[PDB]
């Protein structure tokens, strides 16, 4: 017995970390937060409907300004919209129709798209010629690109279905770092607010904390019974929320190394597609497969509002940087801007 001895050692180590996680669990968040006041019904009206795509929308990303948003649909078109005036600033024609992810640079100078083409293509919006052109096609991935997010204008972290995430230097076009450890297609990636750490959600039903500079996983979070389809970091960056196809969302803590609360209901049996917190981290919005989009209070797991405005699968969801609007994008080629009305 050669492989059996150290594989045993491996399950002994994982049991050790399990009892360490269990030992540090002083109390559950639900009882700790049972003394706080409930948010109550949250009514959001669709202030703007961004019509214009002619195919299912697979991803949307707000610009740092909180006014421009990029949207990617399988019509082969990536459109930058002006949310305030429902106008289309640009409509980039994608080389491949199959787009599964879209990103907006923190500066706003660039946007990126990825998909079954297996390449993340960076587009330079600010050009002297006056047209948006592909600056760099990052092509070193074996599997489809699931989510791509920019740290700077030169560095972008991309998640793929080859079970690996990679940090890319746009100028050279080479992966500075490759993150390996997932045994299943990575479907989602969220960076820390400080952009020092990122959490990746995969079909192996595990989410791993990775550090961009060290190059490898720091922590692994388990507890989902099905593939994680969406992941989002809490505003502080000490927590993240994961949405899976078992119709449940879980809040994990990077310091307690374990989950804290689970957001599920017997009325919902459709898997999550995209999640995102509010500005203060009190509202965890989640887009579901049943055409709806619940608004979970991320402190008591009490469902506090539903955004029912779509007729197909809600695929993307994003709250602005100032937290003053929520944009949902579903498979009926319509984006919708929501905000609370007083």
């Amino acid at each position, epitope marked *: 017995s050669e492989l059996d001895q150290l594989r045993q050692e491996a399950e002994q180590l994982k049991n050790q970390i399990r009892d360490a996680r269990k030992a540090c669990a002083d109390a559950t968040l639900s009882q700790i937060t049972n003394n706080i006041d409930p948010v109550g019904r949250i009514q959001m009206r669709t202030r703007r409907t961004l019509r214009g795509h002619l195919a299912k929308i697979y991803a949307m990303h707000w610009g740092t300004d909180s006014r*421009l948003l990029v949207s990617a649909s399988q019509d082969g078109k990536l459109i930058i919209w*002006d949310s305030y*005036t429902t*106008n289309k600033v*640009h409509a980039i024609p994608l080389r491949s129709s199959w787009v599964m992810t879209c990103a907006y640079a923190p500066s706003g100078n660039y946007v990126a798209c990825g998909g079954l083409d297996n390449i993340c293509s960076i587009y330079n919006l600010k050009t*002297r*010629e*006056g047209n948006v052109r592909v600056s760099r096609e990052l092509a070193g991935h074996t599997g489809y690109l699931s989510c791509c997010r920019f740290l700077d204008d030169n560095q972008i972290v991309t998640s793929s279905g080859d079970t690996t995430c990679a940090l890319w230097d746009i100028e050279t076009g080479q992966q500075t770092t490759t993150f390996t450890g997932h045994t299943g297609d990575v479907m989602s990636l969220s960076l820390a607010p400080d952009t020092r750490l990122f959490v990746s959600g995969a079909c192996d039903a595990s989410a791993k904390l990775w550090d961009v500079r060290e190059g490898m996983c720091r922590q692994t979070f388990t507890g989902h019974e099905s593939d994680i389809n969406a992941i989002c970091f809490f505003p502080n960056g000490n927590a993240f929320a994961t949405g899976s196809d078992d119709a449940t969302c879980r809040l994990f803590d990077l310091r307690a190394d374990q989950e804290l609360m689970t957001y599920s209901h017997d009325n919902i049996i459709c898997g999550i597609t995209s999640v995102s917190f509010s500005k203060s981290g009190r509202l965890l919005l989640a887009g579901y497969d049943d055409f709806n989009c619940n608004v979970w209070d991320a402190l008591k797991a009490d469902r506090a509002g539903v955004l029912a405005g779509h007729d197909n699968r809600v695929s993307c969801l994003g709250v602005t940087d100032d937290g003053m609007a929520v944009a949902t994008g579903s498979w009926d080629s319509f984006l919708k801007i929501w905000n609370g009305s007083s």
Partner: single-chain antibody, 232 residues
């Protein structure tokens, strides 16, 4: 980017002349194009504007009806045919770029210019000539005033600042009263409060000499300033 122009010169009064603006180096089919003219020993003055795809066309009331404007985007050329040229239409005509989306900077690149020598209400902007004998290393503030509040309800303040070197075409310094144009040094700055605007230069060098113009952009009848000239 390059905007070369052809046609224009000695025109007998009461005649006609067509001016061509050949655009090469950018997507001409997606740029709104304006024509601006500058009378000799005088400031600039707007002439005409044609939107992308010729969808919307405007003219200045001085030349409205007498002038016509059209673009040929398959060959990337903008045209201006003038009829019944009087003695007041003698000026250097500039063919400028302009693109209008959120965050865009209109009036990016100005044309070379062609001299026109014909022989034998609205918003007005006021700025004194103020030929200041400046020296390299002086902080200068250039102020122009508007008859109306330039600040629109959406938040923008459609004031544009232009700089024209002696013997060269104008360029964009600051657009919307606070946004610096891409290409100019950081030393330029601007501010305002709806009226009585100013442009501030902190590290004035020997290159920042010429005539400074300020322009409104709320309504299409457009008006420049008198032009502040900096020497020495």
């Amino acid at each position: 980017v390059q905007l070369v122009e052809s046609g224009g010169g000695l025109v007998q009064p009461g005649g006609s002349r067509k001016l061509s603006c050949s655009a090469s180096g950018f997507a001409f089919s997606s740029f709104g194009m304006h024509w601006v003219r500058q009378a000799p020993e005088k400031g600039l003055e707007w002439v005409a504007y044609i939107s992308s795809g010729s969808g919307t066309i405007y003219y200045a009331d001085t030349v409205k009806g007498r002038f016509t404007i059209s673009r040929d985007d398959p060959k990337n050329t903008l045209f201006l045919q003038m009829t019944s040229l009087r003695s007041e239409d003698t000026a250097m005509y500039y063919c400028v770029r302009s693109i209008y989306y959120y965050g865009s900077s209109p009036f990016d690149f100005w044309g070379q210019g062609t001299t026109l020598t014909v022989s034998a209400a609205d918003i007005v902007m006021t700025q004194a000539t103020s030929s200041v004998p400046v020296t390299p290393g002086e902080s200068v503030s250039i102020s122009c005033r508007s008859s109306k509040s330039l600040l629109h309800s959406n938040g923008n303040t459609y004031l544009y600042w232009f700089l024209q070197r002696p013997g060269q075409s104008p360029q964009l310094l600051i657009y919307r009263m606070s946004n610096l144009a891409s290409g100019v040094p950081d030393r330029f700055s601007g501010s305002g409060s709806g009226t009585a605007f100013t442009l501030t230069i902190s590290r004035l060098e020997a290159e920042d000499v010429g005539v400074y113009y300020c322009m409104q952009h709320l309504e299409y009848p457009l008006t420049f300033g008198a032009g502040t000239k900096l020497e020495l």
